[PDB]
Design a protein around this ligand. Structure first.
Ligand SMILES: Fc1ccc(CSc2ncnc3[nH]cnc23)cc1Cl
Length: 167
């Protein structure tokens, strides 16, 4: 039993809700919140900009030190950093950005990072400003993630479409 509330169950391990991931994280304080990161951990907009804003820019400060030490992530890769006031940990995961020309096949590799964590609150990778089809992202999530994932979808219209079209 966990504290996630109001989710629709899609499969044995995947759950979905129309919710603002920032507000959901602040309420649940999950062990892991997933950020829709880029390789530079520049949290300017989309989910990343919102999460970082909610940390009063502490996420960005921590991220800049991480990059100065380690260099950029790989597309499809991840790193674990602090969750600040939102969660114990933040798993920064880089899905391919279609608006940069990145290989959509890397979306499966990106979701594989979730399997290193027993339970996660997450957005749909590569959705939103990353330019991929969210219906496809949900399919890859369900077919790749084996751990327990609670998906927050900000847009109510998109949430309804994801549920109604789910096979
Ligand atoms: F400044 C802000 C502006 C917007 C929000 C809503 S969170 C959100 N944004 C974008 N895509 C998503 N996918 C799942 N949740 C989200 C929070 C803050 Cl703090």
């Amino acid at each position: 039993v966990n504290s996630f509330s109001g989710y629709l169950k899609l499969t044995d391990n995947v759950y979905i809700k129309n919710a603002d991931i920032v507000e959901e994280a602040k309420k649940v304080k999950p062990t892991v919140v997933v950020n829709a990161a880029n390789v530079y951990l520049k949290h300017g907009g989309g989910v990343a900009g919102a999460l970082n804003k909610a940390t009063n820019n502490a996420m960005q400060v921590e991220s800049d030190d991480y990059i100065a030490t380690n260099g950029p992530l790989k597309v499809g890769g991840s790193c674990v950093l602090s969750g600040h006031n939102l969660a114990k940990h933040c798993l920064h995961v880089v899905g391919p950005n279609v608006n940069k020309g990145e290989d959509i096949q890397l979306l499966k590799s990106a979701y594989e990072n979730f399997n290193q964590h027993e339970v996660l609150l997450a957005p749909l990778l590569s959705a939103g400003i990353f330019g991929a089809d969210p219906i496809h992202s949900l399919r890859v999530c369900v077919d790749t993630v084996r751990t327990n994932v609670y998906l927050a979808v900000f847009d109510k219209n998109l949430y309804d479409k994801l549920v109604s079209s789910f096979l």
